[model samples]
Target: HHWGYGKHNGPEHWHKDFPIAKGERQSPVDIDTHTAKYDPSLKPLSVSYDQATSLRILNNGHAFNVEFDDSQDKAVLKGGPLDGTYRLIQFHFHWGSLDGQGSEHTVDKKKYAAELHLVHWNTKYGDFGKAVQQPDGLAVLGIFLKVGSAKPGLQKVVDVLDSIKTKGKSADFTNFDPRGLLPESLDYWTYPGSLTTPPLLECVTWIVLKEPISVSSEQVLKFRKLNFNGEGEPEELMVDNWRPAQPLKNRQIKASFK
Candidate 1:
C-alpha cells in the first residue's frame, strides 16, 4: 500500500489504507487556548539529550529524521503529564508545499510554515513500535516553525540536507544536541492524541509549545529540496507532510502557563 501528502494520497485518503486514520483521539488537534484550562499542577517539560547517542540523520521518503539511540536511556523526556521518563527515539519535520500551510497542529486553527515532532517512547513500553498500542506509550514534543530571523541552531541540520536529497539516504550526525531546537519558553499545551502517521494510534501525550522558533525563508525552502522518490524513481518534492487537526471530542487541553 502507498500513501503521501498529495491531492490523491494525502491524509484524507490515509483511511483507505489504514482504517485507524479515522479513529477518535487522533493527533494534531487544533488547540483552543481560550477554552484550555490552566493546570498549575502540570509539570514543566524536561528534555535531556546526549549528543553521542544521536546516531545519524536521514531522508526517510517522508521527512528528514534525526535518529537517536534510545537504548540505555541516553536521552529522555520527562514531566508534563507523564508518569515516567520516555526515551528520545527520533525527531523530524514537516513543511508546506511551496504555498500550503505545513504545520500539523495549529493554534486557533492558524497554520505555520512548518512543525517539528520530537518522538519519544515510554520507559515501560520499551520500543516505539510496541508503544503505539498502549494508552500511555508515547509522548511527542511539538514545536511550530515560522519565517523570520535565522534560527539559532538549525543550520547544522540544514547544512546536511544536501547529502540526503533523495529518499532512504542517511549520514553520520553527531555531537548535536536536540535540546538546541527548543523555543525560548517551555510553556505549552498538553492533551491526549495519536500518532500522525499510519496506524494513527491514539497513544500520544502531546506537549505543544506556545511560541514558535524562527527560521529564514531560505532555510524553510531548503526542506523542499528533498524528494519523496527513491533512486531511479520519479521525483516528487516532499512537502505538506502535515495532517489536519481532528476533533477533540470531549477532551480538555491543559496549559502549563497562565
Candidate 2:
C-alpha cells in the first residue's frame, strides 16, 4: 500500500522501504545490444500453455494480471537458461502514458511503447514461497510491445480492462491462450535479475525476447484508463506503471542469437 508509480512512492523512493531495490540483480536493466555476447549454447525457450489454465484477470493496484491455475503442470515454461521446469503463474504488463516510452527494459537505451512479463516459478522448489528465495527460482519471459497494427490476440486482454478498471476488481477470463501473444522468433537476451516491484527479490533468470510484438496505439492507450485507486476513491490513472531501467553493474547479458 505504500508503493506506486506516483512521484512520492515511485521507484526512486522504493529503496527506503525495500533495501534490495538498489541491489546488484535488480530487474528491467537496459539491454545494450552491442554489449550482449551471443552464446551458441543458450537453447531456445519452450512454453506449453493450456488455454484452460487461464482463470481470471484482475487489477492488483500495480498492474492488471491475467491469473492462471498453477496447481498442475498444465502450463509450463522450460529451456532457455532454465535448469528445471517452471510453472506458469501469471502475466502482466508495464506501460507508459505516451506511445514513445513505457517499457521497463530498454534496447540500446531506447524505450519501447510497453512490455509484457510472463511470470513462472521453478517447480523443483515445490511452491512459490520457497522458490522465490532461491537464485534460480523464477523465470520471467519479457516481450517488448511496439506500436503497430492492432493485434487481435492482445485486444482480448485489453477488452477485459474495462471490467477491471478499479483496484481489486476482477472478472472471469478463461480459455484464452497466452501463446497467441508471442512473437515469431524465440531469440532472446538472458541475464540474472530481480522482480521489478517492491520486495524486489533477486531470484529471476530474465529471458527477454529480441522480437517485439505489435499493439496498436489505441490498444496501448486503453491500458491507461485503469485506475490505481479502488471504487469510490478519487481516480488515479494507472499510467507510467513501469520502473526505470536499473544499472547492469557486473552482470553479463547473453544473447541466444548473434
Candidate 3:
C-alpha cells in the first residue's frame, strides 16, 4: 500500500481502489491555537533498540518510514498496560509548507511546529493486517517537535533528510536504531483510535509521549526541502505532505498516570 499524489493524482482518485481512503482518522490536523486540558504526568516508556528483531527501510517517496521488525523484543504489554508482541513496523514524518507549523495531533486547537510518528503493530494477534482489526492491536508513538535547540538523537535522522530530497529517490539507511530517538521518560497518553490515514482502521492503540523532541529551525527547513516530484519531473515543489485532521467522533484520549 504505497501512494503519492499530484493535482491529477489526488486523494479522491486514490480512494477508489483503497476504500479505507474515506476514513476521517487521517492526520496533520491543524492543532488548535488554544491550549486544551492536558496532564503533565504523561510520560513515555523507555525502550531499547536492542529488542529490534529486524529492520526495513521503505522508500515510499513521501518519506522514509524505517520499519523495525519486532520479532525479537523483550518488551511486552500485559495486564498492567496492554498485551501483545507488538512489532515495530515503520517510522515516518508529517510536515507543512514551512517549518513553523505542520502536525496532526493538536494541543487544544494549537498545531505543533511538527510531529513524528513511530508506528508499531501488535503481533500478539497475528500479522499486521489482522492486528488492524483489533482495538488494541496497533501502537503508535507520537513525538512532538518544536523549533529550538537540536536534540543530538535526532541528528542521525536529520542528517539523512538530504538523501531523499526528491520524490521516488531513496537510499539505504544502515545501522540505525529507532529507539534512540525516544525521550527518556516512558509516560504516555493512551486512547483507542484508528490510523490517522485512509482506511482509518479503528484498531490502533495510540501512545502519545508528552515530552517533545527539539530540532533547530535549520533542521526543520531541511525537511521542507523534501519533494514528491520524481527525477526530471517539472512540477511544483512538494512542500506540504501532511493529511488534514479528522473528527474525534466520540473518542476519548486517555493518558497514563494522568
Best by TM-score: 2
Model 3 segments more than 4 A misplaced: 1-46, 53-56, 74-81
lDDT of 1 at 193: 88
Indicate the TM-score of model 1: 0.96
What are the per-residue Cα lDDT tens digits for candidate 3 across 33-76?
A: 23222444444354445655434454456665765555555333
lDDT of 2 by residue, 1-258 (tens): 499999898999999999999899998899989989999998888888863389999999999999899888888999888898999899999999999889999999889999999999999999998989999999999999999999888988988899999999999998889988999999999999999998899999999999999999899989999999999999999999999989999899999998
Please estimate how well model 3 matches the true structure, expressed as its whole-model Cα lDDT.
Answer: 0.63
Q: How close is candidate 2 to the true structure, as a TM-score?
A: 0.98
lDDT of each: 0.87, 0.92, 0.63
lDDT against true structure, model 1: 0.87
Clashes of each: 0, 0, 19
Candidates ranked, most accurate by TM-score first: 2, 1, 3
Q: Which residue runs of candidate 2 sit more than 4 Å off their true CA positions?
A: none
On lDDT, the leading prediction is 2
